Swiss-Prot record, chains A, B:
Protein name: Nicotinamide phosphoribosyltransferase
Alphabetical keyword list: Acetylation, Biological rhythms, Cytokine, Cytoplasm, Glycosyltransferase, Nucleus, Phosphoprotein, Pyridine nucleotide biosynthesis, Secreted, Transferase
Gene Ontology BP terms: cell-cell signaling; circadian regulation of gene expression; inflammatory response; NAD biosynthetic process; positive regulation of canonical NF-kappaB signal transduction; positive regulation of cell population proliferation; positive regulation of ERK1 and ERK2 cascade; positive regulation of gene expression
Subunit structure: Homodimer.
Keyword Coiled coil: no
PTM-bearing positions, type Phosphoserine: S452
GO cellular component assignments: cell junction; cytosol; extracellular exosome; nuclear speck
Main localization (coarse): nucleus
Amino acid sequence: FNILLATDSYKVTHYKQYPPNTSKVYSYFECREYEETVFYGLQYILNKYLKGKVVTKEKIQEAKDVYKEHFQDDVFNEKGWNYILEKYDGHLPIEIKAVPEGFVIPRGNVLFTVENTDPECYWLTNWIETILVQSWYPITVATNSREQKKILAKYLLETSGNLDGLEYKLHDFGYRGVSSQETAGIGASAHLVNFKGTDTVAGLALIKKYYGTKDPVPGYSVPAAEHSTITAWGKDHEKDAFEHIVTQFSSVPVSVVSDSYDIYNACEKIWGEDLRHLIVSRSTQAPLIIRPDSGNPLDTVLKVLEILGKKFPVTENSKGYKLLPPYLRVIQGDGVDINTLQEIVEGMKQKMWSIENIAFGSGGGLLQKLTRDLLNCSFKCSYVVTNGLGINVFKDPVADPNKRSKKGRLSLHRTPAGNFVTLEEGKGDLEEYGQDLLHTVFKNGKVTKSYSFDEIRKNAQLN
Amino acid sequence: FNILLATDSYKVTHYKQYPPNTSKVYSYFECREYEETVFYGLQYILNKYLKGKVVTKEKIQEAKDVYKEHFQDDVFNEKGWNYILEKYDGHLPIEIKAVPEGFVIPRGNVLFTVENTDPECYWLTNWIETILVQSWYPITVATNSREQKKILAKYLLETSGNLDGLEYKLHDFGYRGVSSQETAGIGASAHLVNFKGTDTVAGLALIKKYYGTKDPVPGYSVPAAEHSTITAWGKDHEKDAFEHIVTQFSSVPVSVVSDSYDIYNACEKIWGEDLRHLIVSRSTQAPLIIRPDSGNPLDTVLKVLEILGKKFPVTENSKGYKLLPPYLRVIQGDGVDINTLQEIVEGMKQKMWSIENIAFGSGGGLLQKLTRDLLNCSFKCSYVVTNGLGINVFKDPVADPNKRSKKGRLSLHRTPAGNFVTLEEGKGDLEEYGQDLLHTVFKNGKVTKSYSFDEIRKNAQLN
Ligand SMILES: CCNc1nc(-c2ccc(NC(=O)NCc3ccc(N)[n+]([C@@H]4O[C@H](COP(=O)(O)O)[C@@H](O)[C@H]4O)c3)c(F)c2)ccc1C(=O)NCCN1CCCCC1
Ligand SMILES: CCNc1nc(-c2ccc(NC(=O)NCc3ccc(N)[n+]([C@@H]4O[C@H](COP(=O)(O)O)[C@@H](O)[C@H]4O)c3)c(F)c2)ccc1C(=O)NCCN1CCCCC1
């Protein structure tokens, strides 16, 4: 990895565009204008890409050679990068202040600020915008995942009277559905801020290396079938496949995809009759978890539950909702996203089925179908010092008031009512709103403040 | 990187689920059911993750330890992985056959197949589904990028009479808007299959390392401003910022973001009057490229062109379309995706503006706002050998006929009319449809056939 080659191309030319005699460039990140966001992911970026000796004579030469051909011209700031190498042993003369990871902040607040600590490096602040802005991803995954948790919590509490099993109710199936191995690890880790279930193995190692947990692992899974393991037996032998699988995993929970040919026949005739004796004998710690994977998500879930309710002994819980026996559950792992999740749980509640009967799986919808514009994540310069004088800077496009950026030196504070406010124009300097909530997390090549994954989960908890 | 930890968790448990006495598992990848797709990206995956010695005693131990905690149980196939280590020096006993990269194939055709070459490794075929399926990303980016090229080609030809400059008409601005550094490189490279412009520097190194080009670099950029470089001068000095920038880059093309405060005032008064003398003197090889970045994309483009057409000498080309003088162009780099692109060029054509006047920049829309379901990318087992007998395997869910998979051994062929057809059930064995277009690209830990980036671009060319 070469930080000199990890920026948008045009930023290579910016050192020639700032006003002459500019000694400071100060910029900030916010989720402009999903009313609250979970701040998570910066620590990974700081450690993997920004800390330590990130400049070498070799990296400078490689960048110079690439840019000469890429621009068909010499515009690369060789002198500037060499200065960092010689003066700071290749450590970035930058200071980043940020809100603690896991914190849940309303939209439109400063989440982190960046500024150069050496006047010669005024151009460096915005050079690293590209890498830092990618924090939009873990923030958005974490936020969208927590919003789904809010829905599950509401419906589980209503139908059951408690939140038992909530943290296992939305499972990450997104490994194959994301754009890369790196994305998989980052995305899965962001989901784990809220839940404990993932099949995206890459997330475990990331958390362990960059954040850390008291527990051996931050996420868990259970044995489960895929279409290949059912279909390989041949169409006429779907029952043999089911029998073999539940027998192989007789003492642990096991998820079995049941829609290979006819989900309804599988539930009613195969599980419901042919193999019923192998299901009712299972332990409460080892249920069979029936998995539909096609058709309209809500219709399928309701029909599967109706079928099962007629083949197995259902009870009515203390809230009046129907509950399958403890050795039998369902997981809907197809077509689940923040929208459909809501429709499913509401539909289940209307038909009197407890949310305790089900878990949900989501892959592309959880980790891939998200963009930087969902929370309007944006990085902008709000303050500069030129000829020794500080000036408050901002953009304010005529046609889009929503794109207006904040002015001057920023700070994040608690309001008298205990809410959040971002003070602009250095106003935090007046001591009218208590201390600034942002902490220095990076300074001159070193990570100065960090959080464990356990702390982050705690900060991200639902009310 | 540890391949034993680079799969969906449940796949760890599959070796106990397949029918007993299974010696072969054969699976394929297709974009089920955007009528044609560009096959690109597999070579990157093969080289980065699958080739050579990918198993070590250490990697086996690490996986065993992770899985014990992740499943809270011992289900890991230690013996199976040890066999690969001891028998093949940790090289994967797998054969992958694929259509040549860059090929444009209609939906619903086999693109690549996977199978184990050692009966003991029947479980390995699908272990690597997760990593291989991630090829959906570069395929989708390449395809979506090419579809945008088709739109630009149609409108440029109509308004100009030729395709000059088509290869630079859609520029990649997606570095910051993607989910990770790795995604950025892969995504940018996929866009470069069709175009030559990118600010996503990560793409250059990827192409150079895994594919290769005759030219020093596969992609290019030009100097350009960002809001920070304009706003840093202070609101009242937007003109000074513009003047400094065009002067610093007087002999090369330069893109200048002009919507910081009022895009219309900037075009009419600043560029159009105050600094007009610095624009009309520019070389045809170094135009000023005005960049709006906010408001309704079509309305803004039309209004900017109308303004410019009244301040600068416009000509009418041989097709009857208006053309700005050669030292002046526009780039619309906001709100551009496959849908809006079409609306913009059609709107321009209606108002008699040549497509020669404009280039488009797309970031999140080009590289992030895409999912695996856009082209229905899916990997499924279609053939197995159990007890020495081959059987054709498939799924066919009752509620969704669209999820039906192909049966048996597959091959890709040309039809007498020159189209494509996928033969099922080993029917390719009959020699009625010429040779199989799939070629062995990976076998037993070695990449057996590779393509240069130049060959790929050639294969991906528009008709
Ligand atoms: C109600 C059940 N409760 C629970 N369930 C689970 C649970 C259920 C199922 C799975 N696993 C699967 O089901 N594995 C299948 C699969 C895997 C990957 C993958 N990738 N896919 C495919 O990936 C594609 C991507 O889809 P895309 O297109 O991208 O959207 C999709 O198609 C998929 O087919 C499919 C799982 F791990 C966990 C866990 C805990 C509880 C719970 O409550 N515990 C606490 C209580 N407990 C305390 C202890 C004592 C007992 C009580
Ligand atoms: C008509 C013009 N013709 C051409 N133009 C170009 C061209 C124009 C502009 C730029 N560069 C910018 O404009 N740089 C700005 C920017 C950069 C990155 C970035 N990241 N961003 C931001 O990234 C965010 C992500 O946005 P998101 O939210 O994710 O969507 C967005 O906001 C952006 O602000 C913004 C560029 F490189 C190239 C090239 C060739 C031709 C052409 O025709 N040559 C052949 C003919 N030629 C032959 C030779 C002789 C002369 C004639």
